[PDB]
Amino acid sequence: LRQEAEQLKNQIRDARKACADATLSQITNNIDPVGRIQMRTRRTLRGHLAKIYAMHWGTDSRLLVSASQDGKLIIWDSYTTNKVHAIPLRSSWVMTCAYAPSGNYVACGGLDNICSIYNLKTREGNVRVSRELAGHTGYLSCCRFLDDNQIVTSSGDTTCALWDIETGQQTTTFTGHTGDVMSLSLAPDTRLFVSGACDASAKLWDVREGMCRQTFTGHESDINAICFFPNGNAFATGSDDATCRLFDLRADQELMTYSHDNIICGITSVSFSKSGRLLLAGYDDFNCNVWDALKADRAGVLAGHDNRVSCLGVTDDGMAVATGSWDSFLKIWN
Amino acid sequence: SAEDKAAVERSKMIDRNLREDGEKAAREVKLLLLGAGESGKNTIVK
């Protein structure tokens, strides 16, 4: 019962306090901040005709895919800014998109509880639907490609399930969290997809083994987006209370909090850079923001979006960041 | 710039396809059914 869990709840807090007393994440205070990194313009990709919620890059940092309410999934390339696949979409109420690591498949999901899989490389000049994924009652909040065959996606039914595109079935079910699950972020090791659920608690999961090893709490309001640090030693979680945090893996606790007095909005998307020193943001004031994770200070502010951003992505080789604004504009800032 | 020119030509064609679908989507009215269930929603959708 809850009486037994009370002792366990207090026991883990004592261990967390011991780690919190060892360091303060500000012992150095001499990280030599770069300063003004104001990347301005030179990318004004257009083509959509409705609101945009997702924008995912490729492994080669060449192909960019975005999903909109118009029911048209479009694949873009930043270099030549010309549309390559203006493929149609069965569901108009979509909220996420995914791009295969091998550059062969894309995924879409929305309020219809369908995770459609499309094969880009087909010997017919037109993509087809690989199969229809069903089994969720909530909504495809965020979808990612675990590999070329196995994928992991979120749902609005507090259930994250691994999928098998070969035949179609939920190999594993992770229905062990109360709030709503909003987004997930994978790992280069292809083993961790820590959640960004609505109840302000990030729960870690293990691929092919249903279990939770650590839960990260300490956020107010809701959580809308989550990222993952490149080396796997930490990750950043974006809450809806205009606050950000950096949850370390070994420390398993919050060590930094990024929030200014004047700003009160929320985070809709967050993503690290290659080095991880500079962290981007998703503030809802019709503009994006960047925070320096080294000096714990704001590096700069960039704007130019008529509507507030909804998606954000950093290329795997850097030197390009895209913003999925609610307006039908995607800009790669450089 | 040979294949690039053809790629731009394909992009222009599918740009018109997205453009022409814009009026069709905008030519239809959108209504949202709201309220508690079993309150007469069946009689207004059948």
């Epitope: 390559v84 696949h85 010997r123 000049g125 | 040979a2 053809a6 030509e9 394909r10 064609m13």
Partner: single-chain antibody, 229 residues
Framework: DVQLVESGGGLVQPGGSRKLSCSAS????????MHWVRQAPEKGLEWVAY????????YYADTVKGRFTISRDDPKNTLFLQMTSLRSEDTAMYYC??????????????WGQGTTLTGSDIVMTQATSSVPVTPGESVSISCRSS???????????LYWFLQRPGQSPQLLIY???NLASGVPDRFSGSGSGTAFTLTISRLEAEDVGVYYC?????????FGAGTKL
Amino acid sequence: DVQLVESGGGLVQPGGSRKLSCSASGFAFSSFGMHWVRQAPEKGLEWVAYISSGSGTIYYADTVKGRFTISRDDPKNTLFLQMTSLRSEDTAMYYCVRSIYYYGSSPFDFWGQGTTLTGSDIVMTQATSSVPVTPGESVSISCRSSKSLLHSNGNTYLYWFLQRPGQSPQLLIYRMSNLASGVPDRFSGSGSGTAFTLTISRLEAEDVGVYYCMQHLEYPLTFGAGTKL
């Protein structure tokens, strides 16, 4: 299944001419560019004409400029080609070619069965005409061009075909560094600027054929001399 069987050209006479009809099956014709290729009984392949997607762009060869007319029927999924005042040099067997143009695409990846009809351009020259080969050996085929094919975008325009005896050629390597779909990983190519080579290891009995190399920079589509293997 993809079928590109073409019906048309046969016995003709000087002055009189007649048209071609290439029928599509198993694929979307409207989203593909289409090409025609001549093969003389004693010579190699040759460009004829090209129709883009939606008939938005029209090209013709110098030898048939103002003489041949190209047209397509997207609803009927059939491709036509008008001919006027056929000459003796036009006596050759025709090819129907399927192609598409986008980033990462594989142009000239499928060819039709084929029917039998009875200066500024970049010069494609192959110094070798034939090579005796044995199973299990390694052979290198060198293809050279009069103009460098390396564009500022960082990609070159090289295509390779293998002439099976009695059927249509099949694409092997496109862009000199990408293998076509269905082609084993054994086939490979290398080059820089104008000295392009193709490397084959562990020769098999089926590997016998004639290799042709093309260029696509600008648009003087010409075929190579052809090396017999």
